[PDB]
Design a protein around this nucleic acid. Structure first.
Ligand code: MG
Ligand code: MG
Ligand code: MG
Ligand code: MG
Ligand code: MG
Ligand code: MG
Ligand code: MG
Ligand code: MG
Ligand code: MG
Ligand code: MG
Ligand code: MG
Ligand code: MG
Ligand code: MG
Ligand code: MG
Ligand code: MG
Ligand code: MG
Ligand code: MG
Ligand code: MG
Ligand code: MG
Ligand code: MG
Ligand code: MG
Ligand code: MG
Ligand code: MG
Ligand code: MG
Ligand code: MG
Ligand code: MG
Ligand code: MG
Ligand code: MG
Ligand code: MG
Ligand code: MG
Ligand code: MG
Ligand code: MG
Ligand code: MG
Ligand code: MG
Ligand code: MG
Ligand code: MG
Ligand code: MG
Ligand code: MG
Ligand code: MG
Ligand code: MG
Ligand code: MG
Ligand code: MG
Ligand code: MG
Ligand code: MG
Ligand code: MG
Ligand code: MG
Ligand code: MG
Ligand code: MG
Ligand code: MG
Ligand code: MG
Ligand code: MG
Lengths: 205, 80, 85, 61, 82
RNA sequence: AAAUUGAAGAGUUUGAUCAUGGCUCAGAUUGAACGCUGGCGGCAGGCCUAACACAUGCAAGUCGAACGGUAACAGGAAGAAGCUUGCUUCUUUGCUGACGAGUGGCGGACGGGUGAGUAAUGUCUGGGAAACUGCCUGAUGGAGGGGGAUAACUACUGGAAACGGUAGCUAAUACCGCAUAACGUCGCAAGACCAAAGAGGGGGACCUUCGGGCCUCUUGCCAUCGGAUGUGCCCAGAUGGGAUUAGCUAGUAGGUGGGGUAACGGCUCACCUAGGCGACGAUCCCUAGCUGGUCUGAGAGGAUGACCAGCCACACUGGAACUGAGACACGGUCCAGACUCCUACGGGAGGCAGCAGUGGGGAAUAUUGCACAAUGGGCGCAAGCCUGAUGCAGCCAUGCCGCGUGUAUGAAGAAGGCCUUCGGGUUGUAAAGUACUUUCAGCGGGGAGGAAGGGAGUAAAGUUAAUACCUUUGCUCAUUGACGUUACCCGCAGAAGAAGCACCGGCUAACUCCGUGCCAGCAGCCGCGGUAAUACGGAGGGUGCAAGCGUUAAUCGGAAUUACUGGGCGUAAAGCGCACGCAGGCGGUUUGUUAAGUCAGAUGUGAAAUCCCCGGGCUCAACCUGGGAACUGCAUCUGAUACUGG
């Protein structure tokens, strides 16, 4: 129910940095990001149509840690809701819980956020959430619990997150180790390399 | 007021009983062309005032025989 | 017969069958008698026989061995036959 | 019906029950079935390391 | 007779009983003339747990429909919560 | 307000192109099977074959508040013993609490199972009358007087057994007349005729022969009119394929009379008429349970009927009737048959398509489990009993969904593998290392909720001559869980116990070396293999899915490749050789009416579940659930008059 492999193979396979490691070290210094992974990795073919839609879908899946039937249910729910389909799919993948913990910076990366959530440490409205795929709602607090308030890796992750840029649809107050999901985000607040018509075409083949 | 139909008459060769060809106009369930289907009813009558070509208004009653359950209420267009 | 209730139901059913066949043959013979007098033509004896027949069919219809409509159509049947007679 | 035998080599004789599973072999005229290699009397290929589920061979250690 | 009773539609360990004006001789989950209300046994705080249309229920009790044990206790509970 | 937001192509005829045209793949789904692999949890599902046969246990009983009565119990008494002069007791007494057997009332027609039959006697939808309706409820009144039997038991008794037989007994709410009778049945009427049953609780007063008559309250019983529910019945439409099935039908179509049925009806007869059904598919053959739905589809449709729910049919095969409100009766009766079993050879018994399970068949589908704690049912005034329905547990990666196998740092870019233009690349921040966490499995502790009721006592009120009895309303008491070592919470110690399968020539994401040499083999199609095989086998690397992955089967899509939406006919398959013409289809133009088709509003209805839209809960999801539209229909009323029809 996860991918426990070498993460820079994913980062190097897409080519873009997936924000898969912390940021203490430059990830271009960490891996040989120029070539593709594997043996024949200095080859770059004229990438086909199944290839380009698969690469956009896999970039999103390996950014957010979401496996295939989970992603297909997110697509079915996204096309089921009102409004724009890609906007709704990015809204659901942003409303995952461990993405909210990564955006609030309580964990280093998204995988460390998944371990922090899954090891019984996050309080949504003062309630223990044991699950990384909790769906968060607007006007909702999210806090760390008291047995996890002393962990050094949380404040290390906090100094790394406030070294990084901040997400704008959240409120954070890290002296309490808490915050609130103020509003469900828009398409514009996210990144622009994540494309969306490729994903809706691949799951509407 | 009473749920009554009207149809022509095919024959009356047996006594106290006529057979009525109600041509009701139906939509076709797929192609949409309004074809016609004529359903025959064994219609009871007294003293045999009707013959071939009559246009009879009929209502349903208690079953007078095995296959005859409709009796008539008025009769128009008696001749040809 | 494997359930004790089924054994008891068989015994009660055969007792009631003997008794109801007795009652039914009483009613049948009393109706065939007035049919015989009705086809015999003799109106005074036939009407006396129908008066002999009406209380026993109406007692069987009261106790429910037959139906009230069955007794009513029997009485109406032979009243129509006596009227025709 | 006749039925093709897959794999690289086999052990099948007569008098031995096997399972056929359908699927037309293109180049044998008039044979439409394969035998389920691994099933019930026809054991798997010798020393095959890949595609082992299709030919019925346990995991190597 | 026709009774007002409770049919257990739910899952394991967590029932949910919907009341029905049904025949006596039918199944529990079987047919029913009219569906009136429900009673959630493990209904939580701050919410509504039980809902019975006492108009239709008293209409059927006038019409000759009897009562059940649990729905008798529930009708007493609704008219006490009044 | 919302109930939608919905549609992909590719390879392959050819030297090459365009077109027609098949063939195959890419997607979703499964009651699935098999191969490899296999940590947990939640909820669902689990003989599709042989409707094949069954060992063994259980699946329908209950009522002493109907009845005689005691087969065992436990309370109460009497007699007598060492007296253990107050007891261990042994006999009689149904006196009491109870209760095997037996009569009787209700229940076994519900609940459960299966889909063989049935192409319409069934089903779905809308109408209709000529009907019955135990239990439940509303109203109106009755509720007297008697009698004869027969089980249990007694004695004899046939029989191996199952089952009986005789002679006597005994009672009831069992049975039967009698008295009675309306607005009940027959008749237009006069008139005639028709019913029954008590039991229990408490007793003020008169009072019993000590069983009490009498009073009071509960619950029964009868007749009738009702109500609701259920069941029977009829009509109309829709409900597979085939015209290499065009004739069929003698109770057959109708009439009149009789009979019968709860009820109309050839339902059944006598007699008469000679009809009816049929190219809008009768008859005949083959297949099939149908529907709400489910899968797919953008939609119209196609396939299909697993779980769930409604209806129908059947209960070893073929029949028939009784009892009963209701069966032509799953665990009832009677007859015949095959099978299995017992026999004293005379005769008998049985029916898992109930739940488990077995044998067999099969590619394939579970425990001879716990409980009535909950819901519902049966009886009961109740307490309570029965409940293989149901609630749960066991199994199975069968599906859906959720989680885990760590996280961070980490270049000596370690070794080792593999490749190399012998620079090196790659495995690869991957491993080692150091730091941080303990979800789940394990260990120990706390523990909700599913439980509302029921049983005692008291208070108030209602009856009541009555502060008794009973019912309602509260009020204190101990209380009632199979699941259960429960859901969940808390503490422990350690990265420990937890990753595989398919593929890599194109379609199709993913390439190089080595072993072969038209051999071995792969294949879903095109094609590969004949000495440099990116297609076979192995390694390294990768890609895709992930506690699953594939191969097969089966449906739909793509298939506009059966085209109504949505095809084509000169040459690709396709215009009858040509004309006449009945039925059928279509019909110029003006007016008037009708309003059938059409449209529009309302009414009834489209069972609930599901699908969908908003919402609620299980920490999330699956799942459960509230409200809503939809339920593209059918019928009825009411309109409008352009088109089509008369
Ligand atoms: Mg999963
Ligand atoms: Mg959208
Ligand atoms: Mg017998
Ligand atoms: Mg083509
Ligand atoms: Mg060629
Ligand atoms: Mg296994
Ligand atoms: Mg059998
Ligand atoms: Mg046996
Ligand atoms: Mg007894
Ligand atoms: Mg009964
Ligand atoms: Mg069938
Ligand atoms: Mg009596
Ligand atoms: Mg009398
Ligand atoms: Mg007649
Ligand atoms: Mg008659
Ligand atoms: Mg299509
Ligand atoms: Mg039957
Ligand atoms: Mg039979
Ligand atoms: Mg009867
Ligand atoms: Mg009786
Ligand atoms: Mg039975
Ligand atoms: Mg049986
Ligand atoms: Mg079984
Ligand atoms: Mg076997
Ligand atoms: Mg076998
Ligand atoms: Mg076993
Ligand atoms: Mg119970
Ligand atoms: Mg029992
Ligand atoms: Mg599981
Ligand atoms: Mg090296
Ligand atoms: Mg634990
Ligand atoms: Mg509790
Ligand atoms: Mg409670
Ligand atoms: Mg492979
Ligand atoms: Mg490619
Ligand atoms: Mg292969
Ligand atoms: Mg060569
Ligand atoms: Mg070679
Ligand atoms: Mg291949
Ligand atoms: Mg098509
Ligand atoms: Mg196909
Ligand atoms: Mg064409
Ligand atoms: Mg030609
Ligand atoms: Mg041609
Ligand atoms: Mg020509
Ligand atoms: Mg012509
Ligand atoms: Mg015209
Ligand atoms: Mg009109
Ligand atoms: Mg519905
Ligand atoms: Mg929710
Ligand atoms: Mg006109």
């Amino acid at each position: 129910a996860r991918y426990l492999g070498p993460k820079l193979k994913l980062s190097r396979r897409e080519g873009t940095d997936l924000f898969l490691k912390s940021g203490v070290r430059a990830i271009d210094t960490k891996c040989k990001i120029e070539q593709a992974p594997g043996q024949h990795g200095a080859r770059k073919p004229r990438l086909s149509d199944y290839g380009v839609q698969l690469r956009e879908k896999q970039k999103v899946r390996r950014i957010y840690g979401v496996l295939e039937r989970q992603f297909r249910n997110y697509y079915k729910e996204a096309a089921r809701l009102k409004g724009n389909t890609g906007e709704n799919l990015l809204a659901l993948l942003e409303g995952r819980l461990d993405n909210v913990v990564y955006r609030m910076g309580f964990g280093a990366t998204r995988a460390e956020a998944r371990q922090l959530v899954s090891h019984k440490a996050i309080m949504v409205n003062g309630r223990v959430v044991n699950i990384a795929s909790y769906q968060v709602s607007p006007n909702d607090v999210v806090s760390i619990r008291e047995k996890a308030k002393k962990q050094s890796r949380v404040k290390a992750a906090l100094e790394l997150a406030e070294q990084r840029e901040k997400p704008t649809w959240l409120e954070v107050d890290a002296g309490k180790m808490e915050g609130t999901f103020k509003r469900k985000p828009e398409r514009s607040d996210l990144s622009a390399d994540i494309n969306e018509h490729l994903i809706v075409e691949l799951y509407s083949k | 007021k009473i749920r009554t139909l009207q149809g022509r008459v095919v024959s009356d060769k047996m006594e106290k009983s006529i057979v009525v060809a109600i041509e009701r106009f139906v939509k076709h369930p797929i192609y949409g062309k309004f074809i016609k289907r004529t359903t025959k009813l064994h219609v009871h009558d007294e003293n045999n005032e009707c013959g071939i070509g009559d246009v009879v208004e009929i209502r349903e009653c208690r079953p007078l025989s095995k296959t005859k359950s409709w009796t008539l209420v008025r009769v128009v267009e008696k001749a040809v | 017969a494997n359930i004790k209730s089924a054994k008891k139901r068989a015994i009660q059913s055969e007792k009631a069958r003997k008794h109801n066949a007795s009652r039914r043959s009483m009613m049948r013979t009393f109706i065939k008698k007035v049919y015989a007098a009705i086809e015999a033509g003799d109106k005074a004896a036939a009407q006396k026989a129908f008066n002999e027949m009406q209380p026993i069919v109406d007692r069987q219809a009261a106790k429910g061995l037959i139906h009230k409509n069955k007794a009513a159509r029997h009485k109406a049947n032979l009243t129509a036959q006596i009227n025709k007679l | 019906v006749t039925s093709y035998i897959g794999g690289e080599g086999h052990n099948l004789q007569e008098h031995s029950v096997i399972l056929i599973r359908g699927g037309r072999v293109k180049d044998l005229p008039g044979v439409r079935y394969h035998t389920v290699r691994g099933a019930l009397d026809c054991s798997g290929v010798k020393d095959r390391k890949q595609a082992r589920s299709k030919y019925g061979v346990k995991r190597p250690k | 007779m026709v009774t007002i009773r409770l049919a257990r539609h739910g899952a394991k360990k967590r029932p949910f009983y919907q009341v029905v004006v049904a025949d006596s001789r039918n199944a529990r989950n079987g047919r029913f003339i009219e569906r009136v209300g429900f009673f959630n046994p493990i209904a939580s705080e701050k919410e509504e747990g039980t809902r019975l249309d006492l108009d239709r229920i008293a209409h059927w009790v006038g019409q000759g429909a009897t009562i059940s044990d649990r729905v008798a206790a529930l009708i007493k509970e609704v008219n006490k919560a009044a």
